[PDB]
Amino acid sequence: DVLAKELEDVNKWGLHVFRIAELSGNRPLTVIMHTIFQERDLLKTFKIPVDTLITYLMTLEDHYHADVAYHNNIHAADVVQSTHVLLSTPALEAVFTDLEILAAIFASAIHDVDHPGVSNQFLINTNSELALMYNDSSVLENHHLAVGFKLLQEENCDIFQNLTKKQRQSLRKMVIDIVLATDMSKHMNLLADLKTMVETKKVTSSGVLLLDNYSDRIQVLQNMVHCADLSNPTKPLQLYRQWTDRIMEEFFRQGDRERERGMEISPMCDKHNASVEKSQVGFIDYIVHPLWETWADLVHPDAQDILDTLEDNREWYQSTIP
Amino acid sequence: EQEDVLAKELEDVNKWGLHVFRIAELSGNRPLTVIMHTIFQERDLLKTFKIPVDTLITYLMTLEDHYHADVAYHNNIHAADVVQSTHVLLSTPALEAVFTDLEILAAIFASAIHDVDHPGVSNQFLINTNSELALMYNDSSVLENHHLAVGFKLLQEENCDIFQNLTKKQRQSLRKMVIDIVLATDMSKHMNLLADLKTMVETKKVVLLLDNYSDRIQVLQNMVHCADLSNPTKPLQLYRQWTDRIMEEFFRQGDRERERGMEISPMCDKHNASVEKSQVGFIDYIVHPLWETWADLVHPDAQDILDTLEDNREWYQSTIP
Numbered sequence: 001d002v003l004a005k006e007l008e009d010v011n012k013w014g015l016h017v018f019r020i021a022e023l024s025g026n027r028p029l030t031v032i033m034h035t036i037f038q039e040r041d042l043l044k045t046f047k048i049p050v051d052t053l054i055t056y057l058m059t060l061e062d063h064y065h066a067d068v069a070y071h072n073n074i075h076a077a078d079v080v081q082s083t084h085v086l087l088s089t090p091a092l093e094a095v096f097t098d099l100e101i102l103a104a105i106f107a108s109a110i111h112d113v114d115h116p117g118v119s120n121q122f123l124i125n126t127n128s129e130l131a132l133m134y135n136d137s138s139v140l141e142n143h144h145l146a147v148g149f150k151l152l153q154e155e156n157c158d159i160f161q162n163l164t165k166k167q168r169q170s171l172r173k174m175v176i177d178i179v180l181a182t183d184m185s186k187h188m189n190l191l192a193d194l195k196t197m198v199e200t201k202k203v204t205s206s207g208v209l210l211l212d213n214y215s216d217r218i219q220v221l222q223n224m225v226h227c228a229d230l231s232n233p234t235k236p237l238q239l240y241r242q243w244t245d246r247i248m249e250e251f252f253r254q255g256d257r258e259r260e261r262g263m264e265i266s267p268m269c270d271k272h273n274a275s276v277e278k279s280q281v282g283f284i285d286y287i288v289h290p291l292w293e294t295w296a297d298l299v300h301p302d303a304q305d306i307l308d309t310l311e312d313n314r315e316w317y318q319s320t321i322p
Numbered sequence: 323e324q325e326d327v328l329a330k331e332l333e334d335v336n337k338w339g340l341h342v343f344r345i346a347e348l349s350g351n352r353p354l355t356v357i358m359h360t361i362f363q364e365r366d367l368l369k370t371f372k373i374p375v376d377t378l379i380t381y382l383m384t385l386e387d388h389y390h391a392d393v394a395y396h397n398n399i400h401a402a403d404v405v406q407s408t409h410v411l412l413s414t415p416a417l418e419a420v421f422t423d424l425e426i427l428a429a430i431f432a433s434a435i436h437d438v439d440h441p442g443v444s445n446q447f448l449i450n451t452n453s454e455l456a457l458m459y460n461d462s463s464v465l466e467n468h469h470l471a472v473g474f475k476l477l478q479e480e481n482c483d484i485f486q487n488l489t490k491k492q493r494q495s496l497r498k499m500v501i502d503i504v505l506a507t508d509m510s511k512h513m514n515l516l517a518d519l520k521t522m523v524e525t526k527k528v529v530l531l532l533d534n535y536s537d538r539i540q541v542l543q544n545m546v547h548c549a550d551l552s553n554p555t556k557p558l559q560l561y562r563q564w565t566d567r568i569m570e571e572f573f574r575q576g577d578r579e580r581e582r583g584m585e586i587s588p589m590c591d592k593h594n595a596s597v598e599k600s601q602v603g604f605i606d607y608i609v610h611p612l613w614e615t616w617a618d619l620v621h622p623d624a625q626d627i628l629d630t631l632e633d634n635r636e637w638y639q640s641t642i643p
């Protein structure tokens with residue numbers, strides 16, 4: 001009831017995702033995905049049985065770790081809802097097909113599933129079986145994908161059962177391309193290519209973005225989901241601070257884990273040598289703002305208020321460095 | 323008698339155009355084991371790396387056992403041949419004293435495991451059928467990722483860890499080079515590999531000089547890549563055998579495709595085949611553009627390899643009706 005009222009803001013940047021998580025009984029990924037699928041009419045279009053969709057969403061969400069402070073179901077829910085908003089941006093109206101929309105949203109939902117709360121390097125340096133399976137290359141991101149797809153095989157979980165072989169192949173390719181691009185090691189080349197697109201940006205008669213080949217289409221989708229993944233600092237300050245607390249909590253636990261084991265502590269993971277505020281400022285300056293400024297140019301002027309909030313939020317963290 | 327003829331055949335171990343098919347029959351289908359062991363002795367790798375001999379043999383036999391006997395081309399003879407060809411490419415004068423013993427071990431081990439557990443079908447067939455392997459690897463270099471994982475997993479079998487006396491540092495560095503090398507054996511990576519090698523031939527520093535790890539690995543990746551694509555550069559009676567073997571494997575995949583109502587892959591249709599035209603195309607578009615560029619890097623070391631290639635191409639041409 002109060003849930004239904006929070007869920008009207010689903011098309012809005014700055015949805016109260018933590019409140020939705022409390023009111024859904026820790027089912028933000030399920031309720032938010034279901035709402036977006038109903039709103040986009042994705043069950044009708046792709047003939048998804050509603051019970052199959054809910055069983056799958058529940059299974060997926062169950063495979064995010066409740067012990068993990070940042071890379072859990074709430075963050076998945078947030079990235080999903082953020083991608084949903086970015087997909088609705090005026091400059092992208094009627095640009096992407098239903099299957100392309102479904103891919104970006106499915107990709108967002110599965111994109112951190114079964115995340116252990118430690119980095120790829122931690123997994124590589126411990127010689128984990130996961131690093132062994134994936135030859136030390138995008139270990140986590142390959143795992144998120146294989147889990148997200150594998151869950152379709154559980155009882156009544158195949159939400160794609162009515163898609164044709166061509167649709168399934170197309171969808172699967174797009175999902176893999178998007179999630180593999182969520183590895184930060186790919187950040188600089190994604191951004192470089194977004195920049196190049198902005199430099200040679202074309203618009204149709206209808207005033208929306210022209211993307212006429214797979215390469216450019218997937219590039220934008222990768223950058224969109226990447227933007228959603230890195231959208232925390234662009235959110236209302238009250239939301240951004242809760243995300244900040246959770247990432248640091250998760251980073252510190254990795255640091256305590258590395259310390260116990262006599263490993264080099266990873267950057268930002270030392271709870272005894274932390275500058276949370278200084279780190280948020282550098283994060284915005286070197287990563288978040290460069291990316292969002294380029295996105296904003298791509299979809300000008302749709303994202304202007306997102307960028308203004310970003311810039312407000314950085315100044316707050318600056319004001320609060322000791 | 324039969325043990326003596328093997329020994330005299332392995333004397334050509336340092337030569338291009340070893341009689342690898344003879345060695346396969348003479349060792350009782352143990353070409354990878356006998357050729358790897360010979361090369362490890364020839365290079366003093368058992369001493370340098372303090373690999374116990376029983377451990378080496380046990381691992382080599384284990385690895386060899388995980389190549390498929392029923393697979394016409396991507397079996398243990400192919401692996402023995404890539405191993406031996408890499409060994410010969412490593413001994414080229416232009417590259418003398420360039421690579422460390424670990425880098426040598428990396429390239430040889432990578433050659434050895436580069437196709438282990440190959441099912442005889444392409445990545446695409448595995449993708450299209452929704453196989454477990456393609457699901458695990460997200461349709462991305464499915465087989466090559468697998469080859470690596472199997473090669474490394476086999477070290478964990480009883481008395482198989484041939485890197486047990488390597489230090490933590492050596493293990494970390496070897497592992498990273500093997501991964502880099504085998505992953506470049508995916509043909510989807512051929513164009514960027516060639517281009518990158520073309521760039522290095524141009525900004526060539528000289529006995530070749532290699533500054534960073536980017537340049538060191540790039541050469542090793544391309545060397546193993548050349549070893550992998552060396553069949554047409556071999557004495558004709560060997561090349562003819564390799565062509566017969568790849569066409570048998572391709573036609574078998576075609577038969578499986580035809581069977582399943584799938585689109586038959588290029589060169590896999592035995593009812594619409596041009597073995598001779600395809601070989602000339604293979605040389606012109608892939609093998610010769612790469613061997614020409616390797617020959618340019620090691621000038622003049624690969625003249626005879628490149629002459630054999632140009633001779634074999636003209637032979638296959640003559641055979642076109």
Ligand SMILES: CCc1cc(COc2cc(C(=O)Nc3c(Cl)cncc3Cl)ccc2OC)on1
Nearest residue numbers: 182183184229230232243244247279280282283
């Ligand atoms: C370079 C300075 C710097 C500072 C931080 C810490 O800040 C944050 C970092 C991240 C963050 O890095 N998330 C993340 C992504 Cl998008 C992809 N792969 C792995 C990870 Cl951990 C998500 C949210 C944050 O604050 C609310 O990360 N880098």
Ligand SMILES: CCc1cc(COc2cc(C(=O)Nc3c(Cl)cncc3Cl)ccc2OC)on1
Nearest residue numbers: 507509550551553554564565568600601603604
């Ligand atoms: C372009 C025409 C063309 C013709 C062929 C057939 O010829 C051959 C092809 C191959 C061959 O393609 N080997 C291969 C490599 Cl190096 C890497 N990944 C997968 C594979 Cl199957 C190995 C040996 C051959 O005969 C000497 O392949 N492409």
Ligand SMILES: [Zn+2]
Nearest residue numbers: 111112182183
């Ligand atoms: Zn991630």
Ligand SMILES: [Zn+2]
Nearest residue numbers: 079111112229
């Ligand atoms: Zn994420």
Ligand SMILES: [Zn+2]
Nearest residue numbers: 436437507508
């Ligand atoms: Zn291969």
Ligand SMILES: [Zn+2]
Nearest residue numbers: 404436437550
């Ligand atoms: Zn091969």
